[PDB]
């Protein structure tokens, strides 16, 4: 359970690396961490199950980091072998809007990881609220 | 590949078994299919991550099937080895009204399955909308 | 245009048969006219594409007709190839309430017909509003 | 099924061409792909069945594209006869506002294709929601 | 203008006879006064142009006169030859509803008349509000 | 029959001329086409029957065409002799918005035409919704 | 003037009698006081002008006195020519509904009296708010 | 009777002049045509009966017309002898607001006319809605 | 002064007597203290000045109490001569509703008194809010 | 009564003078006509019984006349002896806006007058709504 | 301060006794503890300053204790001499409903106490919200 | 008594002084009359009991007047000894808004005074509504 | 550290017992586990800090449980030495209302634990939302 | 106790300092007072429990003092074991917005202090409403 407890950390490390990727619009690191067969259920998709990375690009063009701050709270992992793991966490986002006001946005996320040829890559993601 | 396809069919089938279980409010099948460490993100949890199974039991108490048919639409399955797999699908629920009118409800579910000692079990579920 | 005007008259007659089958909840006749791989976009389906006839089976239960009168207005027909056609019409439904009041409902419909084994079968339907 | 799998791949490619023609307001290409007797049910038409292409011409004016990205998801294709097909898909549109905000729009679509003079032309379209 | 002033009266007579027909659900007198090719724009049709009498029948079945009273106000006629005339009038309807309350319903009507083989018959009608 | 068809085309054409006239706010054509005794039931009249033409003039004052295309859908014509005819049709109007957005408006119109001294003229109009 | 002051007294007496007839739904008195061609603008006629006595008869069916008391405030009489006069006044109506509550209803009324063949009779009435 | 037909015309003419006086704020004509004792019920008086011409003066301040058109629909006149009359008519008003938007206001009017020393004067006016 | 102090009390007493009569619906006392010519401005009259004891009779029919207490706060009395006076006071009323709940109503009251032939009588009352 | 009808004109005049003073913010005339111990019930006192003239000073400060006309409708006076009276009436206030929109305000007023050393002074005022 | 800390307990106690009396509708204890000239500001007085004990009698009539608990939070006392004090505090009221739903009401209370002949009596109370 | 009448006046004066200080934002006078230990219950404190002169300093920063008048209605004062007192009063404030409009604010106020070493000082204040 | 890990467990255990005590209304256990001085912030206290166990007693009336389930999610504990601790956790509550409808209520809680004479007791509780 | 009473004074001093640091957005002081592992329930964290100092840093960017004054009311301190304590208090915040208006904001806060290596530091904070 020591090579398991450490394995979880890897997941947290990777998903944290994955999050920082989206935060500053680093599409290259996004594609390296996301498989090509990645399924997706998220608010930007309206109840549709998206396939592949392409659909995600749209959100990697522009003003870059908008002085926003995201926080992954209590990551919760599940181990299933030594190449497959899933992690669920609450993601908090802090931002200032239109006039400079401060607001917090919240969303529940789930990610399914697969150790493909050494390195972990995200196969499926699900976001809500 | 064929071992894969068949494997995917194995996932869709159990998931289907579980859904039928929830419809007819059959605890036993539910608990037989849902692990002890099963984590869950769902509307009834208000954005909180749920653990255990004690929580889900609140809904299986009562009048069984409210004469409400549910459909699992185009299940997308992911294979990770031979003991880890995940499936994403849209879930449709048709139910009758007070005045007898017919209505349809939608939610997007994800489920992670770990093959623990031969039999498949759900370790994490995520429902939304 | 007589082999064209006849075939349109014919196409309209089978959809009329299908609509009647639906009105008096005749699923046997209904499935005779709907292909096994039939797809469908419709309000009861919430933006999802449905395959098969089982989903529509749900509306075929519960007594029979009511004081419901349905009408297919100005059916527009396109003849395509060997055994293909598509038809478009506004479907009008005259009904009464619990208070005996008379109301009129509308919906726009599209059906695609294919002739297999000498019989016209609906392979796709799109209903809106 | 290879003369079936090819023809579906083909049908999807022409609707992709049509959708692009619409996105960048290319009416010349648009009319090349839409029959002269094309019919249409669509939100902009308010429950009425439209004939011709002139009505749709209205949307082809005004600069060109915007920061609009459109996508055709899980296109479902039915092959009918000689030169007939019909396709169904959820059309996803990613756009931005005056405030630079990103929004996602959806619409369910059905098109009926006929092959005349060796070319696939759309003879009927139904769009909803 | 004496055979014109009298001709108008005929129209008023006939349309008044036509109204009393609908009031006490006399379908036979309705069909005798309404042509077979009668076009119709009315609230029960939802913006659709109805053709023929059939669609009208629905409203000639039931409780008969419901203790209601209609009044044709200031008829206004137009003469066009000696076999074609159109009349427009405001139609007021008095009724008691659910509990016994008294309410007045109003609608604007237009009718186009044709003298076919001696007797006048309604070819087209349009009601609003 | 052929004299009839051609005659019907005569009605649809003038009506079309009148509609174009209203679009480009061309009084002259309007008044040339609308009789002196023309009665009218329309939304701008609030359920009142209008006489003369003085009233309609209020709308032709100003910026001509607001860059708004109108379409007369499937004109249904009625023949009554050779100097009396009526036509019913749905009318669609596409117009631009403040923010440049596109919008469609609908109304159901009826028009009565009297052939007075060779030229066709409108004696009564009825618009709704 | 004592002749006019006494004449202004008769207008108030008949008008008062007409108001009681209406209160206890005494129709014979009503018709003995309202001309056969009496004109009328009133709430129950929605902006429309009524002619005749027939329209009003609708309201004389039923429960004589509904436990309601109407009061004619400061009648103002105008004597015009010979056998002609008009009166304006506020009409208050106190009534008991449900729950035993007491309420007051207000209206402004105008009536025109013609002394046809001796007896004063109302030829025109306008009621508002 | 034609004597009566012309008297009714005289009444429609003077009341049309009175409307014009109001429309362009010509207070002299207004005073000429209205009696000193004239009473009045109207929106600008909130259920109160007004006496004297004074109260009306206020609306005759500057701003002549306002690109506003007032219409007098089908005036109903009652002739009570040779020196008394009352007229009832619906009055339409199309006004241009801001944004150059065309709207229509409606109201029901009644005017009592007394013929004094040869000339007709309005002794009472009632307006609603 | 002491004579004026006595007269002031006398008015407090009578009016107090008058309110107690209104409380228990004693019409005899009420008409004894309220002169015939008594004028009234009160919420129930809707801004209309009321005359005589008539309009009031409507409130003296009914239960005869209601479990509501009425108080006369700081009566302020003006003495004008030995036969005229006026008093103003805040009037508090406490009442128990349906659900056995106590509530307080308030109102502003002014009364004008006249010592007509010995006894004091109210000739005018103004109530508000 | 010719002496009673005289005292009543005098009371109407002084109160007319008093209101004129209020319109043109003539505080000197106000005080000369109002008793130093005048009582008050009015909206601006929010339910409180005001005493004295001081409270009203606030309102006399400002832009004298604001292009606003006030009329005192049908005044009713009560004579109580040759030295006391009270008058009731509805006061109509017509005023303009920024947009130059005409509006009418309304209130109900009671005033008590006392003859002190020959001059009529107001000892109590009551204004509602 | 040990004498000041003593007088402060005494003031908290008596006021505790006083509130206990109000809860269990013990009017005898209420009066014994409240001065006959006690002043009052509280919701039930709707903004009026009540004087005396009479006004409160109304509330002591009823079902003694209604299953409602009241608590006096952090009392603050002011000692002004050995015979006068005032205390301030928030009073919490917990009560049930018909459905048996628990709720908490809240108010802010100030009370002024005067030592008269040895006993502490409340001369002024103030309750808000 | 006369000594008590003098002490009562003294409290009216000081508190009056205290309100004028608050009106023109004179913090010096305010802290001179308000003892250090002064407690407060006021709308701005939101049901929270406030202590010391601190919380109040926030309102003495600003324009220094505002064109608002403040009155002290019927002060009721209780004398407790020669060094303690309390007063209650309705407080009227008249203010002119943005659009040069006058308005009246009201509030219920109670104050507790202590003659600490010669001068009077407020140790507690309660404001409401 | 494991010593610290077990101390945190002891804290999660006692607070879970306290939740159970509340859940089934066992007031003895409640009193045992809560200190006499326990302070509290919570909805049932409306922003007021509560002191003493008394105030809570109210919620321990009859109706043991209510088919309601309370859940304590991921409890975060802080260990401040061997006799102090504070725990933070989210608390979920699924309750059955009327109609047998399942709902979830949420709230964030914090409990401060002091270890006295060997046994842990709650000295403070804060609850929100 | 003088030791505990002085210890309860330090908790109020540090808490007061922490509140000023937050007021003027002085982060170094903030982090010198909040543990690195401080827990937190607060509005800005929507029902979620935060860990660390990083989340809070978002709010220290910008305009030091926004012209706002916060006040800590009646702090209540609980001393637990050694080097441990908690404090509860209401925090009022008066602020000037736009239009120059003054408002008050209220919140209930709970903080837990651990005396780690001499200096008291906050390890847990809960803020509500």
Got the DSSP string for M15-38?
HHHHHHHHHTT-HHHHHHHEEEEE
**Do M49 and M40 form a contact (C-beta atoms < 8 A)?**
yes
**Residues near G64 by Cβ (< 8 Å), separated by ≥ 6?**
G24, G25
Angle (nearest 5°) at CA A10 between A6 and A13: 130
- The CA distance from L3 to M50, in Å, is 45
Cα of K37 to nearest chain M Cα, Å? 33
- The CA distance from B96 to B73, in Å, is 20
**Residues near F32 by Cβ (< 8 Å), separated by ≥ 6?**
none
Element of type H or E holding H60: none
Q: DSSP letter at L68?
A: -
Residue L46, SS3 per DSSP:
coil
Neighbours of K72 (CB within 10 A): 17
**Do E33 and E18 form a contact (C-beta atoms < 8 A)?**
yes
Element of type H or E holding I101: none
> CATH topology for L1-129?
Nuclear Transport Factor 2; Chain: A, (3.10.450)
- The CA distance from L32 to I117, in Å, is 61
**Residues present in chain G in total:** 129
**Do L47 and L62 form a contact (C-beta atoms < 8 A)?**
no
**Do B53 and B31 form a contact (C-beta atoms < 8 A)?**
yes
Query: B86 in contact with A at a CB cutoff of 8 Å?
Result: yes
DSSP string, J41-64: E-GGGTT--EESSHHHHHHHSS-S
Look at residues I42, H53, H17, H44 and name the one whose alpha carbon lies nearest to residue G128: H44
Strands (E), L22-98: 34-41, 50-51, 69-80, 84-96
Can you read off the two tokens belonging to residue J94? 């017509």
Please tell me which residue of chain H has the smallest CA distance to J93. Answer: H45
Give the long-range contacts of residues F90-97, CB within 8 A, separation 24 or more: F90/D48, F90/E47, F90/E49, F91/F19, F91/F127, F92/D45, F92/D46, F92/D48, F92/D55, F93/F68, F93/F69, F94/D44, F94/D55, F94/D58, F94/F68, F94/F69, F94/F70, F95/F66, F95/F67, F95/F68, F95/F69, F96/F66, F96/F67, F96/F68
Look at residues K90, K118, K116, K42 and name the one whose alpha carbon lies nearest to residue L84: K116
Please tell me which residue of chain G has the smallest CA distance to E90. Answer: G48
Neighbours of F95 (CB within 10 A): 15
- The CA distance from L61 to D72, in Å, is 63
What does the longest C-alpha to C-alpha distance in chain A come to?
50
Query: E93 in contact with F at a CB cutoff of 8 Å?
Result: no
Cβ-Cβ contacts under 8 Å, E50 against chain C: 73
- The CA distance from H114 to H35, in Å, is 9
For C55, the closest of B71, B99, B100 (CB atoms) is: B71
Query: N44 in contact with A at a CB cutoff of 8 Å?
Result: yes
Whether E and B touch, i.e. at least 3 CB pairs below 8 A, reads as no
**Residues near H2 by Cβ (< 8 Å), separated by ≥ 6?**
none
- The CA distance from A54 to K119, in Å, is 86
Q: DSSP letter at H53?
A: S
Which residues, in sequence order, are bridge partners of residue K68?
Answer: K95
- The CA distance from E70 to A40, in Å, is 62
Q: Name the residue with tokens 């065309």.
A: H102
Q: Each residue of I90-127: b (16+ CB within 10 Å) or e?
A: bbbbbebeeeeebebebbbbbbbbbbeeeebbbbbbbb
Neighbours of I74 (CB within 10 A): 12
Break chain I down into helix, strand, coil percent, rounded to 5: 30, 45, 25
**Do G72 and G15 form a contact (C-beta atoms < 8 A)?**
yes
Please tell me which chains touch A, using 3 or more CB pairs under 8 Å as the contact test. B, D, N
- The CA distance from H57 to H70, in Å, is 19
Strands (E), G30-75: 34-41, 49-51, 68-72
Query: G71 in contact with I at a CB cutoff of 8 Å?
Result: yes
Q: How far is CA M17 from CA F115, I53, I83, in A?
A: 95, 73, 82
Can you read off the two tokens belonging to residue K23? 């809860």
Please tell me which residue of chain H has the smallest CA distance to G88. Answer: H49
Angle (nearest 5°) at CA N103 between N101 and N105: 160
For chain N positions 9-38, those within 8 Å of chain M (CB to CB) are 37
Please tell me which residue of chain G has the smallest CA distance to I49. Answer: G73
Q: How far is CA J64 from CA H58, J21, J25, J103, M58, in A?
A: 18, 10, 5, 19, 64
Residue D7, SS3 per DSSP:
helix
Q: Name the residue with tokens 């030229």.
A: F119
Cβ-Cβ contacts under 8 Å, K59 against chain I: 102
CB contact under 8 A, B106 and C48: yes
DSSP string, F47-59: TPEE-SSTTGGGG
Residue D2, SS3 per DSSP:
helix
- The CA distance from G42 to G55, in Å, is 11
**Residues near N22 by Cβ (< 8 Å), separated by ≥ 6?**
N30, N70
Q: Name the residue with tokens 């998903």.
A: A15
State CA L90 to chain mean position distance: 11
Cα radius of gyration (chain I): 15
**Residues near L89 by Cβ (< 8 Å), separated by ≥ 6?**
K49, L15, L72, L73, L74, L75, L76, L109
Whether I and K touch, i.e. at least 3 CB pairs below 8 A, reads as yes
Whether A and J touch, i.e. at least 3 CB pairs below 8 A, reads as no
**Residues present in chain M in total:** 129
Query: E68 in contact with C at a CB cutoff of 8 Å?
Result: no
Which residues, in sequence order, are bridge partners of residue H61?
Answer: none
CB contact under 8 A, C45 and B92: yes
Domain boundaries, chain E: 1-129
Classify the phi-psi angles of K46: left when phi > 0, otherwise alpha if psi is within -120 to 50, otherwise beta. left
Q: How far is CA K78 from CA G118, K71, L12, L79, L124, in A?
A: 88, 20, 21, 16, 8
Which residues, in sequence order, are bridge partners of residue L73?
Answer: L90
Helices within chain I (DSSP H only):
2-23, 27-33
Q: How was this structure determined?
A: X-ray
- The CA distance from A49 to B75, in Å, is 10
CB contact under 8 A, N49 and A104: no
């Amino acid at each position: 359970n020591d090579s398991e407890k450490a394995q979880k950390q890897d997941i947290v490390r990777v998903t944290q690396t994955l999050l920082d990727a989206i935060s500053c619009k680093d599409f290259e690191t996004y594609t390296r961490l996301c498989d090509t067969s990645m399924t997706c259920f998220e608010p930007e998709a309206l109840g549709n199950l998206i396939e592949g990375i392409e659909f995600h690009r749209f959100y990697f063009d522009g003003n870059r980091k908008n002085q926003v701050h995201t926080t992954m709270l209590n990551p919760n992992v599940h181990i299933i072998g030594e190449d497959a793991a899933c992690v669920a966490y609450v993601k908090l986002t802090q931002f200032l809007d239109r006039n400079g006001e401060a607001h917090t946005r919240q969303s529940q996320e789930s990610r399914v990881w697969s150790k493909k040829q050494g390195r972990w890559v995200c196969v499926h993601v699900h976001r809500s609220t």
